[PDB]
Scaffold this active site. Structure first.
Site, short mmCIF file in Angstrom:
data_model
loop_
_atom_site.label_atom_id
_atom_site.label_comp_id
_atom_site.label_asym_id
_atom_site.label_seq_id
_atom_site.Cartn_x
_atom_site.Cartn_y
_atom_site.Cartn_z
N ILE A 7 0.81 -1.21 0.00
CA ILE A 7 0.00 0.00 0.00
C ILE A 7 0.84 1.26 0.00
O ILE A 7 0.29 2.36 0.10
CB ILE A 7 -0.99 0.05 1.18
CG1 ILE A 7 -0.25 0.00 2.52
CG2 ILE A 7 -2.05 -1.05 1.10
CD1 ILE A 7 -1.17 -0.02 3.73
N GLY A 8 2.15 1.14 -0.09
CA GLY A 8 2.98 2.31 0.00
C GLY A 8 4.45 1.98 0.09
O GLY A 8 4.86 0.84 0.32
N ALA A 9 5.28 2.99 -0.12
CA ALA A 9 6.71 2.81 0.01
C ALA A 9 7.26 4.04 0.69
O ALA A 9 6.92 5.17 0.32
CB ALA A 9 7.37 2.56 -1.35
N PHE A 56 12.16 3.69 4.55
CA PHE A 56 12.71 2.46 5.12
C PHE A 56 12.44 1.25 4.24
O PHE A 56 13.30 0.38 4.11
CB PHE A 56 12.16 2.22 6.53
CG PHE A 56 12.78 3.09 7.57
CD1 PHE A 56 14.11 2.94 7.92
CD2 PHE A 56 12.03 4.08 8.20
CE1 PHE A 56 14.69 3.76 8.89
CE2 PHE A 56 12.60 4.89 9.17
CZ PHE A 56 13.94 4.72 9.51
N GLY A 57 11.25 1.18 3.64
CA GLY A 57 10.85 0.02 2.88
C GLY A 57 9.36 0.01 2.62
O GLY A 57 8.65 1.00 2.88
N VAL A 69 5.41 -0.82 2.66
CA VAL A 69 4.34 -0.87 3.66
C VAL A 69 3.24 -1.70 3.04
O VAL A 69 2.87 -1.48 1.89
CB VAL A 69 3.80 0.54 4.04
CG1 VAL A 69 2.67 0.40 5.07
CG2 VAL A 69 4.93 1.43 4.60
N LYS A 96 4.87 -2.15 8.33
CA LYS A 96 6.02 -1.45 7.76
C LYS A 96 7.25 -2.35 7.81
O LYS A 96 7.56 -2.98 8.83
CB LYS A 96 6.29 -0.16 8.53
CG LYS A 96 5.00 0.59 8.83
CD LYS A 96 5.25 1.97 9.47
CE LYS A 96 5.25 3.03 8.42
NZ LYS A 96 5.67 4.35 9.02
N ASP A 108 8.57 17.98 9.67
CA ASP A 108 8.26 17.51 8.33
C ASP A 108 6.76 17.47 8.13
O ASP A 108 6.26 16.59 7.45
CB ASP A 108 8.84 16.11 8.07
CG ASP A 108 9.02 15.76 6.60
OD1 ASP A 108 9.11 16.65 5.70
OD2 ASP A 108 9.07 14.53 6.34
N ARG A 121 1.21 15.10 2.80
CA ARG A 121 1.69 13.74 2.43
C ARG A 121 2.06 12.90 3.64
O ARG A 121 2.21 11.67 3.51
CB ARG A 121 2.89 13.84 1.46
CG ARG A 121 4.11 14.43 2.07
CD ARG A 121 5.24 14.58 1.01
NE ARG A 121 6.32 15.28 1.70
CZ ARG A 121 6.39 16.60 1.81
NH1 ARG A 121 5.49 17.38 1.21
NH2 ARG A 121 7.38 17.15 2.50
N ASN A 122 2.27 13.54 4.80
CA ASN A 122 2.68 12.88 6.04
C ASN A 122 1.55 12.78 7.05
O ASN A 122 1.79 12.53 8.24
CB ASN A 122 3.88 13.63 6.63
CG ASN A 122 5.11 13.47 5.75
OD1 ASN A 122 5.28 12.44 5.13
ND2 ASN A 122 5.93 14.52 5.64
N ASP A 163 4.88 9.86 10.09
CA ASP A 163 6.22 10.34 9.71
C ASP A 163 7.12 10.67 10.91
O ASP A 163 7.65 11.78 11.02
CB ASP A 163 6.07 11.53 8.74
CG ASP A 163 7.39 12.05 8.18
OD1 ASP A 163 8.27 11.25 7.82
OD2 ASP A 163 7.51 13.29 8.05
N1 LIG Z 1 -0.98 3.21 8.79
C1 LIG Z 1 -1.11 3.25 7.41
N2 LIG Z 1 -2.24 3.01 6.68
C2 LIG Z 1 -2.34 3.12 5.33
N3 LIG Z 1 -1.29 3.49 4.55
C3 LIG Z 1 -0.11 3.72 5.15
C4 LIG Z 1 0.05 3.63 6.60
N4 LIG Z 1 1.34 3.93 6.92
C5 LIG Z 1 1.96 4.18 5.74
N5 LIG Z 1 1.10 4.08 4.72
C6 LIG Z 1 1.43 4.27 3.30
O1 LIG Z 1 2.81 3.94 3.10
C7 LIG Z 1 3.54 5.11 2.66
C8 LIG Z 1 4.94 5.14 3.23
O2 LIG Z 1 4.90 5.18 4.64
P1 LIG Z 1 6.16 5.66 5.52
O3 LIG Z 1 5.63 5.96 6.92
O4 LIG Z 1 6.81 6.79 4.73
O5 LIG Z 1 7.13 4.35 5.47
P2 LIG Z 1 8.53 4.04 6.28
O6 LIG Z 1 8.21 2.79 7.11
O7 LIG Z 1 9.53 3.73 5.18
O8 LIG Z 1 8.85 5.22 7.17
C9 LIG Z 1 2.70 6.27 3.18
O9 LIG Z 1 2.96 7.47 2.44
C10 LIG Z 1 1.29 5.76 2.97
O10 LIG Z 1 0.95 5.82 1.58
#
Ligand SMILES: Nc1ncnc2c1ncn2[C@@H]1O[C@H](COP(=O)(O)OP(=O)(O)O)[C@@H](O)[C@H]1O
Length: 255
Positions: free
Chosen positions: A15-17, A20-21, A23, A41, A134, A138-139, A152
């Site tokens: 559902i996302g990146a 770190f990696g 998600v 995550k 930040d 987007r966060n 974030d």
């Molecule tokens: N709790 C969540 N529910 C739904 N989507 C999520 C959630 N957490 C992260 N995402 C998706 O994953 C993307 C990357 O999340 P992020 O927090 O940047 O990852 P990292 O673990 O690399 O810090 C987000 O921008 C969002 O699209």
């Protein structure tokens, strides 16, 4: 930092990146407890011990918070490999993409309620002496009931004294919040559109500020302009922002 046995976790679609990696959406079924959806995550394959510690520090920060507008940590997977951080699932994902995919489809009062939730989460962070640095749409993540939560744990979102003197405080967090208000009320337009970063810095220094989004109530745009005062101590604190938005919600003729 609750430890979650990985056998209780079912990993589903990506559902996302993030930095770190990847998600993933997943399901968490603890014994005796009703299944919930979670976000899982993960850390990019091949991570070192130092990368593992830095990733888990996200979880240790998150686990210090307990507030309806801050993303909830369900637990971590650390006894097995790979490591995972498990958070509550937010069905509508990041706020900026959510609004851009739903342009015009929320009322002003719905949007103000979203902003009030974000301000309450930020107030809680500021009270705990956590400076986010930040904050941007987007966060922020959005659930199925449109509750927004800060996640974030970028020149055009950054207060001018944070850019010029590296002075990051809760008041520079309030500048960013004003930018988030403009993102929300414009349904995800880019702040300052195609202006370059240096053009933004030069314009702000000559007292340019963003205009009201289309159909934005004057009182909401004035609150943005208050968040963007040059002198950081003239900006409202998050406690005052919450109170102002509450009064708008209680007295909707003011919109
Ligand atoms: N709790 C969540 N529910 C739904 N989507 C999520 C959630 N957490 C992260 N995402 C998706 O994953 C993307 C990357 O999340 P992020 O927090 O940047 O990852 P990292 O673990 O690399 O810090 C987000 O921008 C969002 O699209």
């Amino acid at each position: 930092a609750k430890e979650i046995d990985v056998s209780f976790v079912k990993i589903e679609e990506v559902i996302g990146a993030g930095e770190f990696g990847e998600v993933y959406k997943g399901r968490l079924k603890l014994p005796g407890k009703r299944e919930i959806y979670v976000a899982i995550k993960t850390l990019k394959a091949g991570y070192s011990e130092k990368q593992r510690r830095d990733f888990l520090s996200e979880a240790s920060i998150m686990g210090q918070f307990d507030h309806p507008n801050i993303i909830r940590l369900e637990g971590v997977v650390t006894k097995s490999r790979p490591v995972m951080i498990i958070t509550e699932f937010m069905e509508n994902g990041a706020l900026d993409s959510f609004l851009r995919q739903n342009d015009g489809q929320f009322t002003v009062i719905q949007l103000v309620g979203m902003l009030r939730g974000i301000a309450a989460g930020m107030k809680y962070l500021a009270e705990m002496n956590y400076v986010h640095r930040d904050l941007a749409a987007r966060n922020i993540l959005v659930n199925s009931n449109l509750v927004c939560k800060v996640s974030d744990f970028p020149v055009r979102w950054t207060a001018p004294e944070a850019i010029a003197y590296r002075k990051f405080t809760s008041a520079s967090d309030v500048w960013s919040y004003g930018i988030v208000m403009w993102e929300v009320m414009s349904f995800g337009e880019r702040p300052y559109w195609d202006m370059s970063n240096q053009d933004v810095i030069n314009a702000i220094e000559q007292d340019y500020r963003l205009p009201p989004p289309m159909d934005c109530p004057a009182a909401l745009h004035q609150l943005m302009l208050d968040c963007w005062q040059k002198d950081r101590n003239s900006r409202p604190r998050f406690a005052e922002i919450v109170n102002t938005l509450d009064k708008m919600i209680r007295n909707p003729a003011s919109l």
